[PDB]
Design a protein around this ligand. Structure first.
Ligand code: FAD
Ligand code: FAD
Ligand code: EAW
Lengths: 270, 270
C-alpha cells in the first residue's frame, strides 16, 4: 500500500516532527510507500484566493470561489501547488494528519490546506457525500499533540469533551469527503511529559502502525439513514426517526438527537 | 462604546462584505466608534512562526512558540503587525466576527489571526481562564454565512447539530479568553436566497445591533464548578459532581457529561 503523511509544524526539533519520523519509518518497514506533506517546509500558502486558478477567470467581476475553482479543477487550470497535492491524495491509501492542536482545531496552515485542496468534485459533491464520498477507499487518522491534559478534556474537565472538539474535523472535513476515520492518536500533555515517556509514545505509535490498515474505523451515521434531496431538507427518514424513539443513546456526536452521546464516539471504535 | 469588526472574505461583492458594511453603518448611527480588521484587505499574514518574535530568542536551539511568545509579549518584542491587532482588542468593547463558514470552522486566515493574536497571558492565562479571563468585560459575536441549509445542520440534518460545530469556537477560542459570547447570527443558504430576503437579512442584523450590548450572553458552565489546579486535573468539584448525578440534562455542549445537551445551548441564550 501507500500512505500520505501531512505534518503542520514549523520546527524539525519538535515531538510532532519526531512523531512524523517514527510514522514514516515504521510504515516503510512494513512495505508501504510513504510520501510527505510538511506544510511549513513546502512554503505552503494556506489562503484561498482567485490565485488558486491559473489563467483567465470566467466571471472576474463577481468572483465566486466554489464555482470558479470547480471549473478550474475540471479544466486543469488549478495552481501547480494545488495540483501536486491532489495527485498525492488520490495516490495514497492512508492519510495521517500530524499536527499540534491549536485553538481547539487544526493549525491555520493545515486549515487552509483543506480549503485549497479539497476542491468541489475532486473531494466532495452534494450527490455523493459521507459514505458515498470520493475518498471512501481511503483511511485517515489524526495524531494530535496538546498542551492540556486528557483530564482537562474529559467529560468533567474544564475544556469539555474531546469527542465534541474532534467532531467538526473527523466528521465534517474527513468523513464528508468519504474518508474512513481511524481512531486518533491523542498525545495529551506534550511538553510536560518526561523524556522516558516520549520514547514510549514514539514506540507505541510505531507499534499501532504495524496493523493500522486492519483496524475498525470510528462510527458515523451512514447516509442511508437520510432522504438526501433538497426537498426533504436532508433530514432523517421518518422511518429512521421512528425506530429511534425507543433507543437509549444517540448515534454520534453530531447526531446525538438530543440524547446521550455514545461514549468516546469520536475516540473509540466498536 | 467601541467595536471591532473582523472580516474574512476576499471579495467586495460578497454578502459577507455587505454584512460588515451593514453592521458598521448601524453601529455608527448609535454612537459606536467602529474600527475594522479586514484580513484580506490588510493582506494579513496568518502563519505563526519565530518571526512573530522580533529580537533574540531565549532558547533558539529548541524553539517552543507558547513559552517564547508569552515572553516576547512580556518584553514588548512581538511583531508590530501583531501589536496593532492586540491594541484593537484592548480598545474594543464588542467584537464582531463576520465570515463565511468553511469546512465546518472559521477560514484559515481567521484561524491564523487567533493563533498569532490571542497570545498567552494577553488573551488567556493558566491562572484565569473562562470566567476569570482577560477579556471578561468584553463581548464577542459570530456572524456566519453557509452554503448549506439550516435543515442540514439541525439535530436530524445530515451534517448534525449546529451547536456542536459552534462549541470549539465560542467556548474554546472566545469564552476561554474570557469573552461573554452573544447569540451567533446564523444566515443559512446565503447562496440560494432571494434579493428581497437578502435585504431582510441585512436589515434584521442592523436592527439587532441597535441594542446588542443589552442581550443576555450564551450559557457556559462557570469555572467555579471546578477545581482549577494541576493537582485535581481541572476536573469538576466533587460537590458539583455529586449534585449532577441526578440531573437529566448536561450543562453545556462540551460539558454534556454524557447527558442530554440543553437545546440550542450554543445558539440561543436563556
Ligand atoms: C497557537 C497555539 C494554540 C494552541 N492551542 C491549544 C489548544 O486549544 N489546546 C491545547 O490543548 N493545546 C494548545 N496549544 C499547545 C500545543 O498543543 C502544544 O504546544 C503542542 O501540542 C506541543 O507539540 P510540540 O511539537 O510544539 O512540542 P515540543 O515542545 O517541540 O515537544 C515537547 C518536548 O519534546 C522534546 N523532543 C523533541 N524531539 C524529541 C524526540 N525525538 N524524542 C523525545 N523528545 C523530543 C522537545 O524538544 C520538547 O522539549 C497551543 C499552542 C499554540 C502555539
Ligand atoms: C473552502 C470552502 C468551504 C466551505 N465549507 C462549507 C461548510 O462546511 N458548510 C457550509 O454550509 N458551507 C460551506 N461553504 C460555503 C460558504 O458558506 C459560502 O460560499 C458562503 O457562505 C457564501 O457567502 P458569500 O458572501 O461568498 O456569498 P455570495 O455569493 O458572495 O453572496 C450571495 C449573494 O448576495 C449578493 N450580494 C452582494 N452584495 C449584496 C447586497 N448589498 N445586498 C444583497 N445581496 C448582495 C451576491 O451578489 C450574491 O448574489 C464553503 C465554501 C468554501 C469556499
Ligand atoms: O500549555 S500551553 O502551550 N497550551 C494552550 C495554548 C492555547 C490555548 C490553550 C492551551 Br491549554 N500554554 C498555556 C499558557 C502557557 C503556554
Amino acid at each position: 500500500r501507500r500512505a500520505l503523511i501531512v505534518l503542520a509544524h514549523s520546527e524539525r526539533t519538535s515531538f510532532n516532527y519526531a512523531m512524523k519520523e517514527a510514522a514514516a519509518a515504521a510504515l516503510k518497514k512494513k512495505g508501504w510507500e510513504v510520501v510527505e506533506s510538511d506544510l511549513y517546509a513546502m512554503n505552503f500558502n494556506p489562503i484561498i484566493s482567485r490565485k488558486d486558478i491559473t489563467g483567465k477567470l470566467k466571471d472576474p467581476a463577481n468572483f465566486q470561489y466554489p464555482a470558479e475553482s470547480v471549473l478550474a479543477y475540471k479544466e486543469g487550470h488549478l495552481s501547480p501547488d494545488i495540483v501536486a497535492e491532489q495527485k498525492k491524495l488520490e495516490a495514497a491509501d492512508l492519510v495521517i494528519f500530524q499536527f499540534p492542536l491549536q485553538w481547539f482545531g487544526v493549525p491555520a496552515i493545515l486549515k487552509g490546506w483543506f480549503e485549497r485542496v479539497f476542491i468541489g468534485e475532486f473531494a466532495y459533491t452534494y450527490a455523493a457525500m459521507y459514505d458515498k464520498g470520493p475518498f471512501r477507499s481511503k483511511k485517515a487518522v489524526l495524531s494530535i499533540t496538546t498542551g492540556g491534559s486528557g483530564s482537562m478534556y474529559s467529560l468533567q474537565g474544564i475544556h469539555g469533551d474531546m469527542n465534541v472538539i474532534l467532531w467538526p474535523i473527523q466528521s465534517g472535513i474527513l468523513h464528508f469527503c468519504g474518508f474512513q476515520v481511524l481512531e486518533p492518536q491523542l498525545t495529551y500533555s506534550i511538553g510536560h511529559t518526561p523524556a522516558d515517556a516520549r520514547i514510549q509514545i514514539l514506540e507505541g505509535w510505531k507499534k499501532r502502525l504495524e496493523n493500522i490498515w486492519d483496524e475498525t474505523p470510528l462510527y458515523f451515521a451512514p447516509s442511508s439513514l437520510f432522504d438526501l434531496n433538497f426537498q426533504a431538507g436532508f433530514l432523517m427518514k421518518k422511518e429512521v426517526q421512528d425506530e429511534e424513539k425507543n433507543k437509549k443513546f444517540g448515534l454520534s456526536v453530531g447526531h446525538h438527537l438530543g440524547k446521550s452521546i455514545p461514549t468516546d464516539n469520536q475516540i473509540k471504535a466498536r
